[PDB]
Point group: C6
Chain length 63, copies 6
Amino acid sequence: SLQDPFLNALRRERVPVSIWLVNGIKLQGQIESFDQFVILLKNTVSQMVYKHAISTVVPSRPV
Amino acid sequence: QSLQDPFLNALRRERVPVSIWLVNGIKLQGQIESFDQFVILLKNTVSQMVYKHAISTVVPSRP
Amino acid sequence: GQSLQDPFLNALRRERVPVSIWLVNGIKLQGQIESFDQFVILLKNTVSQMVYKHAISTVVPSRPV
Amino acid sequence: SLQDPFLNALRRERVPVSIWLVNGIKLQGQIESFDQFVILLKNTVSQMVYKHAISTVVPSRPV
Amino acid sequence: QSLQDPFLNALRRERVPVSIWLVNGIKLQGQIESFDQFVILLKNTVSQMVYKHAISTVVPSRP
Amino acid sequence: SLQDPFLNALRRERVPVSIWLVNGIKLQGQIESFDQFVILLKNTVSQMVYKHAISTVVPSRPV
């Protein structure tokens, strides 16, 4: 798995990401947590995003 | 299972109202009655069955 | 895993409750649940049509069961 | 499996069906053949349809 | 297995031009070079990898 | 099976790719790495792309 170190680094370092969804909508926030199926995106509000609904995870700055 | 399950369980036991957004953009509302590997039973006017595969985000109305 | 789908659909079926089945594309199907398996739901209306679970967003009863 | 007898009888009896796609498009034709993942829709032209792209299979007449 | 494989193989061996419609409505064109459980390699000006999960229909330019 | 040699060939040769998403948005960059579920695409930043959201991976130069 490359997924787990990619997300885990962005979570340890508290990097602001943009999570684009498969319908077009972008979301922005810090990655509070994740597991095999979902990512907890902690923003103004902490929301759970299903990976199946995600197209790409983009760090706002080069880490 | 180690983020998704306790997130959805905390919501279910505390009976917190949630916004469940589908991938097609619609926003369902209500309280989580129960959930398994595939579906979430969401209760409001009736108990409706929502397939996880059709959900983008789950948004708790309080932390 | 199965625990919940089968009892939920069976309750509607046995009680012949009219359901709205919403598709992920926003189209809404209507009718009675005639049967189901792991992947499909047969929805009886003017005809018995086969609906793929993968294309279903929500199953919504018409009356509070 | 309920799927196999449903499709098999529409094929044996050569019933014209109106398959539906998860994007909106409807296809019409007879079911020439199928397996676990695809259905062969025989029309003016034969085309293989992936089930994952199908929402519903609707017979044009009550069989 | 038994419909999808020999269909995509007869297309590959006979080098028949096909139309691969995606679920988003785009029509890719070209010849099947190879395929496994998940992807189809479609050759035209280059060889592009098309994920089956994103395909609605495969339409051969001849029977 | 075919994915790996395809992506590895693009990666090793550092061939720029267009990755089309199922929503029709096109991403661009180099392939850094990939696992069973994701492709790390390096452009201005290293972004993680979910395979489930990809329709087609397209090279810019014929291999």
